[PDB]
Amino acid sequence: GRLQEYQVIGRHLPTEANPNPALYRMRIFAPNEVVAKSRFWYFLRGLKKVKKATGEIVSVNVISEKHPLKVKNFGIWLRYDSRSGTHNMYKEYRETSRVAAVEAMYADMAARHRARFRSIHILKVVELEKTEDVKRPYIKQLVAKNLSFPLPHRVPKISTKKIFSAKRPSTFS
Amino acid sequence: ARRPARCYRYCKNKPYPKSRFNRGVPDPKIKIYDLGRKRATVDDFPLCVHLVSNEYEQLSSEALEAARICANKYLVKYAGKEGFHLRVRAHPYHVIRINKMLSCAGADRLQTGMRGAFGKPQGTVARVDIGQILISVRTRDSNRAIALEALRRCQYKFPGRQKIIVSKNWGFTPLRREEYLEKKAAGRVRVDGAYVQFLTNHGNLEENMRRFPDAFK
Amino acid sequence: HAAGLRSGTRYAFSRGFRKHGQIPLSTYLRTYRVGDIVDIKVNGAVQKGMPHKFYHGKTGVVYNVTKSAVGVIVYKRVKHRYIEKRINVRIEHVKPSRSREDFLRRVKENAELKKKAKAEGVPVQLKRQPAMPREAHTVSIADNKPVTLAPVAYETTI
Amino acid sequence: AKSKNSSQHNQSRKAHRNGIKKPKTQRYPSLKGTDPKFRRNHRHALHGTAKALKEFKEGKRE
RNA sequence: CACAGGGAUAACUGGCUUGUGGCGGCCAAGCGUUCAUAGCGACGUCGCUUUUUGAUCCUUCGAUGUCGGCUCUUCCUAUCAUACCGAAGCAGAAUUCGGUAAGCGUUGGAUUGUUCACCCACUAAUAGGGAACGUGAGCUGGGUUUAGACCGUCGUGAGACAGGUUAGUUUUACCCUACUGAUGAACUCGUCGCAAUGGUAAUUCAGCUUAGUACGAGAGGAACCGCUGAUUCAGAUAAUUGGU
RNA sequence: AGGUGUCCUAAGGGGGGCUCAUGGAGAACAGAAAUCUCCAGUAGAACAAAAGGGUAAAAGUCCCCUUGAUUUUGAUUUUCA
RNA sequence: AGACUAAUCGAACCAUCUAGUAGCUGGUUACCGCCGAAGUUUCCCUCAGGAUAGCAGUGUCGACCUUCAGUUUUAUGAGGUAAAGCGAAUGAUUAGGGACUCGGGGGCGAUUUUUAGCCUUCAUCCAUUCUCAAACUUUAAAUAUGUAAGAAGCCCUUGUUACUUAACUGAACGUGGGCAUUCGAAUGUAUCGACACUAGUGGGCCAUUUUUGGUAAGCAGAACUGGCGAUGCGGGAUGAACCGAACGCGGGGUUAAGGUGCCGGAGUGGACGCUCAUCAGACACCACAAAAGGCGUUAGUACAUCUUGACAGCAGGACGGUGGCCAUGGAAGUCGGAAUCCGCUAAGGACUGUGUAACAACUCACCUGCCGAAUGUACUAGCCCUGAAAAUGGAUGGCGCUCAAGC
């Protein structure tokens, strides 16, 4: 959907035997903070022996892009579930912000591999600082020197209510 | 007899082993379970491969021997009689019944139809789960390709879907390859017949020293 | 299909593991009065005065006392109505119940705690209340810096 | 020919149709089943305590 | 032999299932002069069909006429023959495996009520099935399945036998639709024409020549064109011959 | 997968002393197996019968005395209206 | 011949008893209003039928009794299922090692053998190892289940008795007195208690989870709850049981399940991808398809090679010891048997083939010249294709649809 990145911090409920427990922080992509908390308890239940009934939420914040007007390359590590077994991939994207790459990745995996949102885990997202660390061949062509190309055969836009045109259109816009 | 295997594929009844309540079950088809040089030391064969199931189904006793023979022949021809050790780790203990409609209820009519339809023993089958190990092979490191091909050839005799996994342990021991190597250097491993035993430092001091002379320096 | 007096009691009436043999002798030194709250628990060793298997686990009220047995009143649920049942049980099977001890403890404390306040002159708020939602507080991160977590990649164990 | 053997499909709903009625508890339970030896003496005890309390108007004044 | 009822319950069709019956795949130990796959395939394993037989009892007991043959139309392809092709442990001849293909054919007799089967003879070939196990107001009535009678085994007896044998009534269309043909109101009565849509048709063999040629040590032994006839089917006609 | 139309003057009641199945080492005839002796032994033995539960100074085993397997009627539990 | 006895015969015809009996078929006559079921328990020569309890209606009385509850919280009891276990008892089961000979079998040093000699094959014992149990177990859930939460309560003092105690020591029932300023968890109370009389019903069926016999079934049999029967309305084209939602007569507004190219009320609406099928595909219950394959296309995992320049293509070379030791009418790399070193270099092997009576010639291997950035092998899963054969003409509902009107 339309996502944005959060940070959420949790803690085990303090007890007389263990005052001042440890603090854990995660980065979660979610449409809103109501489901942002829900994903935090899901990932934590697989790493430590803490539940929601015996825990609490300390703080939830919103992380915004530092430079949302600069073009940069991204790389994503992820795992998912197929119809038989689990797998690991690593894909790359080109855009202006961190949030949209997760949006683009979710739509891409749903089409090419029929993978739903229920069965995808995001491990790490990192912005590629240099130009020699681009691996996949569908992105080197987008960073070639002096890129330029025409746009042949583009259909003109005509109002959907104006039927019965009076002359033949042209496709040389 | 020997109805097609399609008719007894799904685990649909509680386990029905042979006991003092059912009598006269036929003798199962598979007898031998270990083949090859089944007395080599642990240090000789450090590579292990498995054939792991991926469905919750039933495997017939007849199919188990067919796969054992097929894999044994390929390994002997290309790796030698003394270059491997093969073990089958699935034992059939479940008895499947049959209702002989024409043998029991034909010619002389007696009683026909569904009246009194409890059947008689007909064979033995094995129950498997998801992720259960079926066949294991250990050999040298230079025979990795041969071991994989032999297992891939023998899955055509089984119904369903199976996978091939190369284990990260040392032989048949439940220890990581790196971990076992360093523990042996500490003297806490003693040789036995085709297996090993480990030091446990929770007994009287007298015979712990002779059994493990290199542990104490 | 048969229905005997002790049918289906293979595990209910049996003694536990490592508990066969002599009955602890403090059982016969207890005393009972009418109106007490007792609960039934059948002992396998004693073969006299055993109630039916339905009452194994129910709680009742004593209504009669005799030389070596007590009479208990329990309520049985037949379809669409309740019925009063009266049974005779040997003392090896009955046992005093802690069901009402919390109530008897609380009434005694309340009476004394109300008396002292009335002399002093302050409201008590004696009656209990359920758990309430937590209140606001502050947590410091001095020498308790949080650690970041992440999901782990797939790996084969066996 | 053959027919259904037994069922319990609609019995629970039928019972709750107009409540599961619990008999009312009451102050003075009956003394049926109590051993007779204690029952005989208890009769004599109550006979005396009525006469003594009746004499409270021209008598003991305890 | 009778009565009150039952599709709450059997014998026939139809419906779900496919164990048994039939048909088709996958893996490759081996057979195959030597060589797993020219042609086959053990131990195992995945499917399809409803012309076999079972299991079930949903629809009909104020009734759906229950075996076989005769006659006649149409459809399916898992292809016996015919057209054109791909493979071989295919020299020729003769054969075996597979593809596109249902346009066109698939017979005459001895015994049996038979379905099924088995022999003689012709032929390019004498392939397998469906349509309420097609088809009784279309026929026939040999079989089964009322009442007469005989034998064998069983029963003290009346009587029984999916054991053998002989004789035994087959009703109605003029109604609606469907089909094959024939007239026909309205815009004056006529003559000469165009063609939307529906139907559609041909089939196989032999003789002469090619040639005792190609091929082969020999034994054996083809084909294209060309010429002339014949089998099954279809539409007309009556000069001659035959029937009435 | 099995059982019942029975059996008991004790195989019912009270009391007392003792501890079983099995294994190890020993002794003329004596051996795998006959009788005697020592040590270990949680029930792995026994308790009329099918199976389940229960029992060790006993509910097993032997010994001593007996007929509560007797008289008059009520309340309560299981199948259940 | 069970034949004939007035169209009647395995017992004629006429009137009466007679309106003979039926647990079995068929029928049972005006309107409106309110409430509203059962196919289950026990007994019966009972199984197409009755009695009995249940569900239902009507008539009321006692108070408006402040009592109650298909519910939650708090305190405290019971259980042997799912899972788990067998280096823990009973039962089943695969494989080696150590210790033992007098337990059995076959040998050796003279099968000498009463030689605890040397061998060994089973058996035995001990420390380990691979798999199981509806009628096995040391342990042990979730869901459901019993009781209690006070005024009929708590405490003090002391009267009765034929019971009990050595004993006014106990036991029940009592008189008197003390304790609310707050009668001692939440929420609701659109429904409190008792009695009288009686109708219909006692053939049921379907679905989620659990589950028994059977190869399976629109097949037979059970547990908790929701439905049809007894019920319309909007969607699934159609369809007692599926999804939404339950109904007096009308007007305006807003939605649910499902839909917006036309039939058809409302988008040829927006964003990123995948697919070309001479059998495409098109929405749960639901009207079907598998094992095994593809150098069709897309995305991914691991290893190996490369600007010190590979992969493809073309072009140049392709040497000695030495015809090695052997074999021999003849074999010089190339019938055959057995080994595989060194010179020179960037590279050419006592060689992978062709070939000579035997040499030769020739090929391969290997290196070099040209070029300009990628290349090789093995695996995973998306759409598509092969596998894919039935009978009147035919059905994603129809027409039709290709940067879709498909996913």
- Torsion angle, alpha carbons of A126, A129, A131, A137, to 10: 10
* Alpha-carbon gap, residue C89 to C49, rounded angstroms: 5
Closest nucleotide relative to residue C74's CA, C1' based: G146
Nearest-5° Cα angle at B186, B180 to B189: 60
Q: Do residue C149 and residue A25 have CB atoms under 8 angstroms apart?
A: yes
Query: Which residues, 6 or more positions from B71, have their beta carbon under 8 angstroms from its beta carbon?
Result: B86, B135, B137, B150, B151, B153, B154
Instruction: Indicate which technique resolved this structure.
Output: cryo-EM
Quick one: which of B41, B83, B84 has its CA closest to B193? B41
Q: Do residue C150 and residue A87 have CB atoms under 8 angstroms apart?
A: no
Amino acid at the residue B189:
V
Q: Do residue D11 and residue C79 have CB atoms under 8 angstroms apart?
A: yes
Strand arrangement of the beta sheet that strand A72-81 belongs to: A86-95, A72-81, A120-128
Kindly report the nearest CA distance between residue C104 and chain A, in angstroms.
30
DSSP D22: P
DSSP C14: S
Q: Is strand E within 7 Å of residue B69 (CB)?
A: yes
Q: Is some CB atom of chain C closer than 8 A to the CB atom of B50?
A: yes
Q: Is residue C30 within 8 Å of C94, Cβ to Cβ?
A: no
* Alpha-carbon gap, residue A78 to B216, rounded angstroms: 49
Quick one: which of B130, B49, A81, A79 has its CA closest to C158? B49
* Alpha-carbon gap, residue A10 to A59, rounded angstroms: 8
CB neighbour burial string for B161-194, b if at least 16 within 10 angstroms, e if fewer? ebeeeebebbbebebeeeebeebbeeebbeeeeb
Measure, in angstroms, how far nucleotide E166 C1' is from residue B108 CA: 35
- How do B120-127 and B58-60 pair as beta strands? antiparallel
C80 CB neighbour count, 10 Å cutoff? 15
* Alpha-carbon gap, residue D27 to D34, rounded angstroms: 18
* Alpha-carbon gap, residue C54 to C69, rounded angstroms: 19
Quick one: which of B127, B132, B99, B134 has its CA closest to B17? B127
- How do A23-30 and C147-148 pair as beta strands? parallel
Query: Which residues, 6 or more positions from D23, have their beta carbon under 8 angstroms from its beta carbon?
Result: C82, C84
Closest nucleotide relative to residue B65's CA, C1' based: E43
C74 CB neighbour count, 10 Å cutoff? 18
* Alpha-carbon gap, residue B197 to B191, rounded angstroms: 7
Q: How many CB pairs under 8 A join C and D?
A: 23
Query: Which residue pairs from A11-18 have beta carbons closer than 8 angstroms and sit at least 24 positions apart in sequence?
Result: A11/A55, A11/A56, A11/A58, A11/C139, A12/A50, A12/A54, A12/A55, A13/A54, A13/A55, A13/A56
Amino acid at the residue B204:
N
Q: Do residue C80 and residue D35 have CB atoms under 8 angstroms apart?
A: no
Tell me phi and psi for residue B131, to 5 degrees: 85, 0
Token pair recorded at residue B17: 């082993």
Q: Is residue C38 within 8 Å of C59, Cβ to Cβ?
A: yes
Q: Is residue A16 within 8 Å of A64, Cβ to Cβ?
A: no
Q: Do residue A26 and residue C139 have CB atoms under 8 angstroms apart?
A: no
Chain A nearest-CA residue for C149? A26
Closest nucleotide relative to residue B162's CA, C1' based: G291
Chain C nearest-CA residue for D29? C63
Range 105-134, chain B: CB under 7 Å to any strand E atom: 112-114
- How do C81-90 and C94-96 pair as beta strands? unpaired
**Resolution of the solved structure (Å):** 3.1
Q: Is strand F within 7 Å of residue C6 (CB)?
A: yes
B13 is in an annotated binding site: yes
* Alpha-carbon gap, residue B162 to B17, rounded angstroms: 26
Nearest-5° Cα angle at A94, A88 to A97: 100
How remote is the C-alpha of C133 from its chain's centroid? 30
3-class SS string, C38-90: EEECCCCCCCCCCCCHHHCCCEEEEEEECCCEEEEEEEEEECCEEEEEEEEEE
Measure, in angstroms, how far nucleotide G357 C1' is from residue A60 CA: 100
Q: Which residues in chain C (99-158) have CB-CB distances under 8 A to chain B?
A: 156, 158
What residue spans of A3-136 are helical by DSSP H?
A: 33-44, 98-112
Amino acid at the residue B57:
E
* Alpha-carbon gap, residue C10 to C7, rounded angstroms: 8
Breaks in chain C (C–N beyond 2.5 Å) sit after none
Query: Position of tokens 């990932």?
Result: A43
* Alpha-carbon gap, residue B174 to B17, rounded angstroms: 30
B195 CB neighbour count, 10 Å cutoff? 11
Quick one: which of C72, C98, C91 has its CA closest to C25? C91
CB neighbour burial string for A106-142, b if at least 16 within 10 angstroms, e if fewer? beebeeeeebeeeebbbeebeebeeeeebeeeebeee
How remote is the C-alpha of D51 from its chain's centroid? 27
Dihedral class, residue C30 (left if φ above 0, else alpha if ψ from -120 to 50, else beta):
beta
Q: Is residue B86 within 8 Å of B155, Cβ to Cβ?
A: no
Quick one: which of C31, C63, C72 has its CA closest to D28? C63
Kindly report the nearest CA distance between residue D3 and chain C, in angstroms.
20
Kindly report the nearest CA distance between residue A149 and chain C, in angstroms.
41
Q: Is residue C80 within 8 Å of C68, Cβ to Cβ?
A: no
Query: Which residue pairs from A46-52 have beta carbons closer than 8 angstroms and sit at least 24 positions apart in sequence?
Result: A46/C151, A47/C149, A48/A24, A50/A10, A50/A12
* Alpha-carbon gap, residue B135 to B143, rounded angstroms: 17
First and final C-alpha spacing in chain B: 68
Contacts of A24 in chain C (CB under 8 A): 146-149
Kindly report the nearest CA distance between residue B174 and chain C, in angstroms.
9
